[PDB]
Every structure is written in structure tokens, then in C-alpha cells.
Design a protein around this ligand. Sequence first.
Ligand SMILES: [Ca+2]
Ligand SMILES: [Ca+2]
Ligand code: NA
Ligand code: NA
Ligand code: NA
Ligand code: NA
Lengths: 479, 479
Amino acid sequence: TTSRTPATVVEKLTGPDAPNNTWGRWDIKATDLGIMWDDGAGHVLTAFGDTFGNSWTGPGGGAPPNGNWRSNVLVRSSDGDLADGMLFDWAAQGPQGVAREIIPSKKINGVEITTIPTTGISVGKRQYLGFMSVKQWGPPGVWDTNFAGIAYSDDGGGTWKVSDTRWENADGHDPFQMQAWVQKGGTIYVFGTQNGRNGPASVAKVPASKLLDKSAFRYWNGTDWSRKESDAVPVMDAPMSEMSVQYDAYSKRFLMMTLSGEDIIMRTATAPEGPWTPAQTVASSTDYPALYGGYFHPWNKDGEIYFTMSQWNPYNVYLMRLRIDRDGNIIDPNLVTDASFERSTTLGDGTNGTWAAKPNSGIDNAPAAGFTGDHRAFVRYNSGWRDIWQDVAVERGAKYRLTGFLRTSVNSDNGFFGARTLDGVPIGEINFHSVGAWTRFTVEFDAGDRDAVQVFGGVWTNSGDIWMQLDDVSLTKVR
Amino acid sequence: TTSRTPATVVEKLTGPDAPNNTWGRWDIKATDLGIMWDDGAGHVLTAFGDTFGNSWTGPGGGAPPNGNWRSNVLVRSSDGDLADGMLFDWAAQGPQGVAREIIPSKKINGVEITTIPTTGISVGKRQYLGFMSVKQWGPPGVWDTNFAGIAYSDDGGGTWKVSDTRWENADGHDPFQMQAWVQKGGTIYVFGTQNGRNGPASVAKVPASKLLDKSAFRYWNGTDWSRKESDAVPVMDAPMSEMSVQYDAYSKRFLMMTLSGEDIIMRTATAPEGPWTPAQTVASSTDYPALYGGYFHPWNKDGEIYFTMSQWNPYNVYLMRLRIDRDGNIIDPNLVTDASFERSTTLGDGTNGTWAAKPNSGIDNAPAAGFTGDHRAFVRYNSGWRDIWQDVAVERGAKYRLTGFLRTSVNSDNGFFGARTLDGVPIGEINFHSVGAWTRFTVEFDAGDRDAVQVFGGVWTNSGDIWMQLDDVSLTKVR
Ligand SMILES: [Ca+2]
Ligand SMILES: [Ca+2]
Ligand code: NA
Ligand code: NA
Ligand code: NA
Ligand code: NA
């Protein structure tokens, strides 16, 4: 939909230009999902789906026959400061230098093309990784699974065994093929959808110590929680996709993220069986074309909700953030309009929620040309101060946080990124020189006694034919 | 010298192809030194000298006017597992996205061109960073300092203040311009050289709690430790460079590393005043041309000695290892001859410590063409198995570790790296596909009942015109 996107892009976690350099460290050049859990020993384990190496070019999933295709990979993090990104400090490798596949797959189309992780947790000293055996893919959003299964690790993710616990899908419509786990007290709640993205969500529950025991599961039936999987009724209507559920102590509610039709949405509840509050837009397909996934980071605190989001054309995973209040409502949205430049193919005049820029400028539009999506802004010349800017309404005497992604031609010598009055008077800014990789800059400032500021990035072009590219600019209120 | 190098290359820590991605994370594209100390809170702080960003090309230090020249930068590590590299998890930045200069300099040639860190230590809640103010550079190994100073931080390296504590260089020949600190019980020993690389080492000591109080220093005079700095006498003869001193519990000895003339060497002592055992070669200038630095990692144990080495042409820092026994003697040297390919401009026949390769092979030779140095091997073809190898003598029944750096054409689909019998039958190998970045591969294997093996790397070339490059190959006994 054309709905505004409240969420802010924090970091590209995988693939080309990722700070993590997963491409160079582990041959993780393109991948998806980024499913996260706390391992119980002060780390976050992150699992990924179909993953390609060095020869991948994009756009989209899939690579040449030498693309080192793995069905899944697994990395760790110790990073407790997500505002500045999420560093990966370990991966499961084999050989050393190459992140390996942890759950094997036959890679025979129409039998088992792949194995895709769906949700993870730890209990005591064991790690558990739900996954689906994919028989074949169909059109976007449509695919057939053989079963949901569970792998486990007793060494912190270093080695993995596939358990004998399965939800078979003989008729295709089994309602727990793609799971999402959340612990509350002694119970693990187990959300489930069918294979693909067109059906509803159901819910089951299991004592935390009995996750692998099918006989200990009980299924919400409308009235109570009973023994038979066939008694499960939906708790959230179609369409639902891959899901993530988190119990948020700030708001004292469960939070659920999924792609529902076109957009990633969030719903909230105080009971896992519902009622579930209506969808709130997290990210729209207009701003983030061909987005999917949406998994909560286990260390979310204080209503500052970080999550991973996937996108088809760059086929890589992004760390995102949004803010909730104590009722689970999204507040303090990105105040920049058309933050990822995807909504227009031209600049405007900088007013009424448009971008403007000095000659020569434009919106580059090509598969995966953006930091995210297919659009980015640029400016380029060989004389003088050359900038891109937007007028944003703000609250008098409030404090704001500006982030955005940029890179320059190698010969760039002096640019700036920041906020200024509508008359050009700087409020707060940083200074960059030459920027190779897509790089995030970050400026915090007081609005002062004004109700509008101009957010901007630019380069001096006195020294030569110099350019700057810009994407995914966010202005959010602080607190 | 032409002496063999026992030391093994572990990882490129900074710059192009570095796993750490310092270039993309922090605009650290080219740098030197990598001076390390324990911060007393579970981390390793690492400081660097003159640092350049995105527009740096090399070879050598120095960059175009837009090179984002900083006199020094600082990064952190929490990595306890040095065999597979040293991950940096934090940097002092300003603006965010750019590692900043922590000790300011005037950048006025012949007044103060730069400020260069020398040695570091923590006592209680405070970090200290010794530095030299450089008035002007001379020919290689020759420069003039104004003084040696000490900066400090009370917040784990986040913010720095330059202290009033100084060793002025009035007569040009002050013996403590370029320091190395080592702590033993309650005492810091402060080794010192004159400016540049052609004089001797002296030694002082101070109570660890009184590092900033000049009055508290005592200076080894040949009989005891006295109050006057002009009473200090040499404990190690010229020529001495930058130095690193560690107390090694394993061997119960002080270990000292320095460039001494052409080669980096190590000396050992049970007392800081000496006597110092004779120099042992660490790395030779023939294998590692224009090498410098050599700083011990503070978490070394068990006789596994990790250190940082600098090299002019690539102008970046590498992690290195050697092994010592309990007398501080270097053992289990790299058995591969001409590990870095620097000793010849052509291939040999694979015997008597030479390399061999299939058609079409060569030694590529240009400034900074190597992973390290100017030389790397290549093999390239469009049919069949295409490999580079060397016959290496081994001990029957012993276990070996093979590491080496390689990368391929994008179109590579199936290569191997390992050890095999002289008749070509693999003993232990790994399988790579397409390798973008210079990437280290690692194989451990048992020699069996054999007196020699062939270490190799190669690619299958049936799928197209495909090439592999190779450098810095090491075979070391395990344990
Ligand atoms: Ca975009
Ligand atoms: Ca070399
Ligand atoms: Na995928
Ligand atoms: Na972080
Ligand atoms: Na330097
Ligand atoms: Na490591």
C-alpha cells in the first residue's frame, strides 16, 4: 500500500556494503530472514534462509551454478547497542572462511528443494531451531512444505542435530508449517501458519522443558487448549506470512510482526489466543518494495523495537527500528516523507513533503539501485555547494535524531549531512570527506523555536566532478 | 636479511580485504602500528598511527588531499580466539561512521607534522596512551620528535585528555622519546629509545599508580635505579626501533619485540635491566619487505605468541603468530620456504624449498600486489585441474596445521587447498568455490608414516577461463 512507513533503517546486516562484511568473512553475499533468539549465555543467534556466495549478482534470490548455495546459515552477536547496528562476532563455518549449512536439504525440486529456518529459542543449555522442509516453490507467496521440524544444539549453535519432532503436511493445509515461538514464564507459545502467505495464524503451547515432545503440546480450540492439532482454530485472519512474536515488558503485551498482503504490520495482545489489536503499518510495499520477514530482536527494551527485514531485489537483511508507547501503539514515526525515494521518479521543490536538489540531481531507478529498494537520490556537479534537502515539520523546542545513508565519488573532499533552518542557517551537522561503502551518518539536534527544519546532505564540488548518493533518511523525535 | 621467517600470517586486520572491514565501518583504509593493551574491563584497546580513508590508493603511507588524514585512531576488541583473527567490536568515532583522531596534532611540517602513539596500559579505571610529537620525518628510520607525552581516558577510551607529563627532546637525543610499557606486580617498566630507529634501548620504572608523576620515575644506571634521567644507560644496544615488551608467565620471561636493522627480532630477559638473551629472528625483510612495528597481544598464553606487524607498501596491519617453549625459544617455525613468494620472480620445480605450478602460472610482482609484500603466485587456465605446490619435509607421526591466503576469479566453481602425498593423493584438504576477498583457509592433518608432503592450492578450470592467487602459506606443527 501507499501507507506511510513509521520504521527507520538502522543498518544493512548482510551482503554488499554491510558493515558486518559477511561476504568477505563467511561468503554470505546474499541471504534472507535473520531469525533471532537469545542463546541463554549472553548472545543472540541469528539464522538465515537460502544463502549465496561471491558469484551472486542479483537482483533477487538465486545465483549462477557456482553461487555456493546453502539452504541456511547461522551467525552470533554479542552487541547490546543496536542504535548503531548489530555486529556479528561468530559464524558456524565449514570450511573455515565459509559459513556452512546447518540443517541439510536434498535440493531435489518436488521432493525437498530446501530447508528454511522459521523461529528459534533456547531452554537451559539447549538451542532449538524450527524449520520447514520445502518441497517446491510456487508464485510469490505460495509454496508447498513437506513438514515443520526442529533441530537442536547442545554447544551454543556450533553443531546441530535434526530431532524426530515433525508436523507432517500430507494434505498441504497443516496449520503449523511455519512457526513462531515466544516464551512466557514456564510456557512456550507456538504460533503457526500454513505453507506460504495466504492463510491464517493458529496457536499452540508447550511447557518450556518439553518443546520436543509432541504429546505435551496443546492447541487453542476456541474454548480451551486441547490435545489434538486438528482442533486448532485461527486466532488471526488470513493473510499471514512468516511471523515473529515477542513479549514486551515495557508495554506488558505480546507483539506480533508479519507481512500481511502488501505491507509488514504489527498486532498486539495481552493473551496469545487474542484478542489481537488491529494491524498497524510497520513498513509499506510503496517505501520498501518486495519486503518480507520481520523478526523481533530479543533484547528490545524501553519501547525501542528493533527487528530484521528482508527485501527481494538486494536479497539481504536490514536492521530496522520503530517506537511504541506503553499501550503498544507505534509513536514518533519517521517524519521524512518518501524516506527511501521510492515514491517518485523526480525531485520536487522541497516543500509539502517533497525532496529538492541543486543541479545536477535526480532519482536513480534500477533493480536494487537503492541502499534499499530500487531508488536513491543523487547530486553531482564540478562547481560549488551541491545539496539535496526536504522541509520537515517539527515541534518547537523538541529534540530530534536524523539518520541517513550516503556514499560519494572517490574524489569527494567535503560534504555535510544535517538539519538547518528554512533560511539556510545550520542547526546541527556532521562533515564527511570521501565515502566508499554506503555509510550511515547520525545527527542529533534541538529544533529550537521553529516549527520546520530542512534536512539535507550535500558535497562541495569545487575540487572536481563529484557526486553523492543518498537513501533511507529518517527524522525521529527523541524520547 | 635472507633469514627464514618462523612467523605465520593470521589475518589482515585493517584496510582493503580485511575481515574487520575497518575501511567501510570507520573509514580506516590504510594505517599502521596496532599498539595493544588490556583495558582492565575484559577488552583489548588498539591504537594506530597516521591513518587514511577512502581515497588512499597506496603504495605506502600518504594519500591525496581528500585522504581524511588522522594522526591516530583507536579500536576495541573482545576477541579471545586469535587463531582465526582479531575482531574489532568498537571504535572511537567522530562523526559516527568515521574513526576519529584521539590525540590532536598541528600538521605543520618542521613544527609538529603528527602525533604517533607508542605504547599503552591501564591502571585501575584509567587508560594511558604514550605518544610522540613528530617535528619532521627524515629518510626511512630517521625522524625528529619534540617530546614524548601521555594521554589518558577515564571512560575506557571513549574520550581522551593530553596530560602535562612529558620527556622533552631539547638535545635531539632524549633516550625515552619512543616508549614501551610493561607492568609486573605493582611496577610499570618503561623502556625507551631515542627518536627513530638507530639508537639503543634504555629502561626506567615507576609505581603503577604514579605513571603521570615524572618525580616518581627511577632510571636504570648500570648499578641501580636513580632519580636523574641523564643517569640512564643502555640495556640493549643500537639499532632499536619501536618496541613492545610483555611479561610471559608461560616461560617466566620478559619478551621484547623490535625491528633491529633489517629484520624484526625478539629478545628475552628475567629482569628488565637484563641480561637480554640474543636476538631471534621473528620476520625477515626478504620475506616481509619494509616490515615494521611488532606489538604483542596482551592475552597471549600457553606460548602462543600473537603480535601485530606493519608493512609499508600495503600500509596496513597484520596479525601474526609464533610459538615459544618454556625457555622463550621460538619453536615449530613455518616449514614452507618462501611463504610470501617474495624470494623469486619465477616459479621453480616444487623441490628443494621451491614452488611449482601447472600452466599458466607466474609470480605477480608490483608494489603491494601480494596479500603482503609485492609478490603473489597465480595459476590460470580453461581446462582441467590447475594447482600450485611445494614439497615440505615433515616428521613421521606428527600433526600439522596448514594456513594460506587465496582468492579467485568470480567464475571459479571448485578449488581445493590442503596437503597431499608426493604422488598427489590428498591427506587433508578443504573445498572452496568462488572467493572474492583474499580469504584464509585452514587445514589440520596427520603426516602419517611419511617424511614429506606437498602443500597445495588449486582450481578446476573446466567451466571457463579461471584463475587463483595465493600468498603467505604456512605449515606448522600442531601443539
Ligand atoms: Ca531507496
Ligand atoms: Ca607476498
Ligand atoms: Na529465500
Ligand atoms: Na551496535
Ligand atoms: Na605511518
Ligand atoms: Na578471533
